């Protein structure tokens, strides 16, 4: 986009459109994010899906915006955690993950 306004000579300033999504990505891929908590617990010989779950919350819940506790009803089957992806809210079930 920015090339055009540069080619033409228009005066339009704008922030990267990607940026809007960085929030969600960090939450997943960053160090204290989902995957990590997921892959750490996998090291605990006596961890539970339930265990994992709590770790997920204690650390992201209330502190993270893209992080949310599910909406259990509608066409959904159970509760664990929703995320706020660009496309929308996804209700995730954590069972078997470990």
């Amino acid at each position: 986009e920015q090339e055009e306004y540069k080619k033409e000579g228009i005066e339009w300033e704008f922030i990267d459109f990607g940026m809007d999504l960085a929030a969600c990505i960090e939450l997943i891929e960053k160090p204290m994010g989902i995957f990590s908590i997921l892959e750490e617990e996998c090291m605990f010989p006596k961890a539970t899906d339930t265990s994992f779950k709590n770790k997920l919350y204690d650390e992201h819940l209330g502190k993270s915006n893209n992080f949310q506790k599910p909406k259990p009803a509608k066409g959904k089957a159970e509760a664990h955690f929703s995320l706020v992806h660009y496309a929308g809210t996804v209700d995730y079930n954590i069972s078997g993950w470990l």
Binding site: P31, F35, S36, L38, E39, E40, M43, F44, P45
Partner: protein
């Protein structure tokens, strides 16, 4: 992979270092925790003058060097000589460059705050590692046996400990330390074996008493009517062949050596013994957590490897614990590396990445950052 391959795990002991890559099943490197300093000027053929020697070259050449142990009773006592053992570990033993490897280290049970900050100062400021982490030893042993609550009896070369852990937090006020371990135990065998009418005269006689202790020693259950058994003289005896022919026989003393761990009185120690101490740790903890600790006595350390240690401990604490209780003494086979394996698991784990102390954290927060 960046660091999946790349995480190092170094377990610093009083007698041995255990080291290797997070991911492996066992330590890539195991070697004595010594630093030898030559008593005289001179050289080996083909080498240059060496100021210092570490690990096995210090042990092998001990006759011309003054040997020193950096870790007294699990705590680092000399920081000049420890930085020497670390240097050796990275550069010669694992042959890695440290400045591109995250390093998980271990410390002892009530390791002084200031030390955890000092080895962090040396890891980041003289070795320039990307990130590091210090785990408590009993805590890695427990975790390597799958669980998160239990009490670890940990026993190696210079210290024994009891570290009650609840949902991962080691309980400071219930931890017990008993300064009698495998080192003390080799020297006691030594005397009951010279006392059997023998002589460990040259250094090739000294060293192998320790290999007798490891191979032939036992912890008998009913150590009472085992001495009684010794006397009727059954085929309980056991002869070991020395570096040469000199077949030495050890019948009885074979178990008189680990009976030292239950009776410190065998060695002029007035302290209580392993089983009582397991127990006392436990009646120092909260009441509601005592059924948990009792069903999860995890054992780790080289000196807890004596066969029948677990059965004796099983019966030692059943008979001190209220009968309403379930006793359970877990002693895995790899226990001489539990600590290390627990670190390998943890550091290769998917969720641990967010607890690594990075140079960013350090250059910005001071050694305080990792100290917790």
């Amino acid at each position: 992979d960046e660091d999946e391959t790349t995480a190092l795990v170094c377990d610093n002991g009083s007698g041995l270092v255990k080291a290797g890559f997070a991911g492996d099943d066992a330590p890539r490197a195991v070697f004595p925790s010594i630093v030898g300093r030559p008593r005289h000027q001179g050289v080996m053929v083909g080498m240059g003058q060496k100021d210092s020697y570490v690990g096995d070259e210090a042990q092998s050449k001990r006759g011309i060097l003054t040997l020193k142990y950096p870790i007294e009773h699990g705590i680092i006592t000399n920081w000049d000589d420890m930085e020497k053992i670390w240097h050796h570990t990275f550069y010669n033993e694992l042959r890695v460059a440290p400045e591109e490897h995250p390093t998980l280290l271990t410390e002892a049970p009530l390791n002084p705050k200031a030390n955890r900050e000092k080895m962090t100062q040396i890891m980041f400021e003289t070795f320039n590692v990307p990130a590091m982490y210090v785990a408590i030893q009993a805590v890695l042993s427990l975790y390597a046996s799958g669980r998160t609550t239990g009490i670890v009896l940990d026993s190696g070369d210079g210290v024994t400990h009891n570290v009650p852990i609840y949902e991962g937090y080691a309980l400071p006020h219930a931890i017990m330390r008993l300064d009698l371990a495998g080192r003390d135990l080799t020297d006691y065998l030594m005397k009951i074996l010279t006392e059997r009418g023998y002589s460990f005269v040259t250094t090739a006689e000294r060293e192998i008493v320790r290999d007798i202790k490891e191979k032939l020693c036992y912890v008998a259950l009913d150590f009472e009517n085992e001495m009684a058994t010794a006397a009727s003289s059954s085929s309980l005896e056991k002869s070991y062949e020395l570096p040469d022919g000199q077949v030495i026989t050890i019948g009885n003393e074979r178990f008189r050596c680990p009976e030292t761990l239950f009776q410190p009185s065998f060695i002029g120690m007035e302290s209580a013994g392993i089983h009582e101490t397991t127990y006392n740790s436990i009646m120092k903890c909260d009441i509601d957590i005592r059924k948990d600790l009792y069903a999860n006595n995890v054992m780790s350390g080289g000196t807890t490897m004596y066969p029948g240690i677990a059965d004796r401990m099983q019966k030692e604490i059943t008979a001190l614990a209220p009968s309403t209780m379930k006793i359970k003494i877990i002693a895995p086979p790899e226990r001489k590396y539990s600590v290390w394996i627990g670190g390998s698991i943890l550091a290769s784990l998917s969720t641990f990445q967010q607890m690594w102390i990075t140079k960013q954290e350090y250059d910005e927060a001071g050694p305080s950052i990792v100290h917790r």
